[PDB]
């Protein structure tokens, strides 16, 4: 990928990977993650019905005009992997997408994380287990740190992370798992999930004998 | 409105035979022309190859002539078969309308022209797996609601390969959903959980169940959440 990134409000100017020779004929694709494709620009300047007129492509007029997709008023929601399908007179089919100008859109506001915590469910402490689940949403930006307690003491055993990701809302999402035995669990007073974020924390805490 | 919906089957072997499916709505597939695409961890998107009306196909030559392509007009469904898969084969597969342009450059009794497609309506994708080990099917767990709205879920458990997807109440309960992307555990395991935010007043008479599938293992589980029962 080719990374760019734009400022909220600002106009993107996406060149394509690969310059024509001749007559060209460009289609531009948008890829969100968790979604498929979408056409935003056909035979160079094209525009498909439901695409805003935001999103714009160079009309090939017998310049060196370098094939270029211009964004206006950037939007969070425009922040996605962006391809030039690029077709030209002089270099046969082009069976490649070419790579992906991979759009970060920043100045977002902050924005704290939602944090929900539970402990393991009867269900699985009755199948011998227990997962204690931290769920974290809706935070930007998305560098955080989770770290997990036992009582007051920190915690490295049984610990799982994603990686922050962005949401359709274009903020982020993660989540942490705690595995433990049963009788860790019920030995404790009490477990937390700790999410600090732009220099604040959410807490949350479950204790076996709360309900 | 036409609507295109593949189904493959989540995981094959290595040196063993890919098959997808487009089931398409809406519109006969006589009226386009259709091609396949896939999104491999890591790389860009890959063009695998595209079929006209007189049931005619071109291949990249990426594919090295491991795949077919082909419709079935009395399913109205689009075919894709890859055979010899390796893990590189490991993608996200979608069936697109491909809509054929022709760009004069010249006279075209001089052939002084090309062919180009532009991909107009796509599927949403069904991620194929390539790998050795076998599948595995969820465990679910009920993620009991807060006692004192109120956040409840399910815990998708220890699940291969990806993906796994999740509704509420069969289809009928969407607003406050948020199904959280999977971990990825040293076991090489899934995880996911899948949360709802309800009226806290609503618990104990409005039934929460949260439909998990996992199409790799055939694994439906229906699974109620309710209030602790303390």
């Known amino acids: 990928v080719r990374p760019l990134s734009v400022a909220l409000g600002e106009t993107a100017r996406i060149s394509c990977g690969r310059q024509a020779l001749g007559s060209r004929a460009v289609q531009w694709y948008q890829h969100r993650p968790g979604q498929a494709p979408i056409l935003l620009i056909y035979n160079n300047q094209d525009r498909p019905s439901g695409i805003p007129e935001r999103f714009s492509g160079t009309p090939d007029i017998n310049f060196g005009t370098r094939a270029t997709l211009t964004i206006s008023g950037v939007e969070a929601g425009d922040e996605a992997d962006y391809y030039c399908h690029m077709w030209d007179s002089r270099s046969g089919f082009s069976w490649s997408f070419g790579g992906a100008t991979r759009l970060t859109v920043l100045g977002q506001p902050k924005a704290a994380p939602s944090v929900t915590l539970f402990p393991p469910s009867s269900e699985e402490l009755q199948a011998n287990k227990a997962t204690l689940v931290c769920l974290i949403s809706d935070f930007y930006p998305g560098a955080v740190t989770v770290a997990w307690k036992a009582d007051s003491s920190p915690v490295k055993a049984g610990v799982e992370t994603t990686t922050p990701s962005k949401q359709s809302n274009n903020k982020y999402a993660a989540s942490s798992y705690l595995s433990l035995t049963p009788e860790q669990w019920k030995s404790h007073r009490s477990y937390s999930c700790q999410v600090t974020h732009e220099g604040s924390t959410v807490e949350k805490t479950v204790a076996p004998t709360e309900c | 409105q036409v609507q295109l919906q593949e189904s493959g089957p989540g995981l094959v072997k290595p040196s063993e035979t890919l098959s997808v499916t487009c089931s398409v709505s809406?519109?006969?597939?006589?009226?386009?022309?259709w091609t396949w695409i896939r999104q491999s961890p890591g790389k860009g998107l890959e063009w695998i190859g595209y079929?006209?009306?007189?049931?005619?196909?071109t291949y990249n030559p990426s594919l090295n002539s491991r795949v077919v392509i082909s419709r079935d007009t009395s399913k109205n469904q689009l075919s894709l078969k890859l055979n010899s898969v390796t893990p590189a084969d490991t993608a996200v597969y979608y069936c697109?309308?491909?809509?054929?342009?022709?760009?004069?450059?010249?006279?075209?009794?001089?052939?002084?022209?090309?062919?180009?497609?532009?991909?107009?309506?796509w599927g949403k994708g069904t991620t194929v797996t390539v790998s050795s080990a076998s599948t595995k099917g969820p465990s679910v767990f009920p993620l009991a609601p807060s006692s004192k709205t109120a956040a409840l879920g399910c815990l998708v458990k220890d699940y291969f390969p990806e993906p796994v997807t999740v509704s509420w109440n069969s289809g009928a309960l969407t607003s406050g959903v948020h199904t959280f992307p999977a971990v990825l555990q040293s076991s090489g395991l899934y995880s996911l959980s899948s949360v709802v935010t309800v009226p806290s007043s609503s618990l104990g008479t409005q039934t929460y169940i949260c439909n998990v599938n996992h199409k790799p293992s055939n694994t439906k589980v229906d699974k109620r959440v309710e209030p602790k029962s303390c």
């Open positions: 697109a309308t491909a809509r054929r342009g022709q760009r004069i450059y010249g006279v075209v009794s001089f052939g002084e022209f090309f062919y180009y497609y532009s991909m107009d309506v």
């Open positions: 809406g519109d006969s597939m006589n009226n386009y022309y």
């Open positions: 079929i006209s009306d007189r049931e005619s196909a």
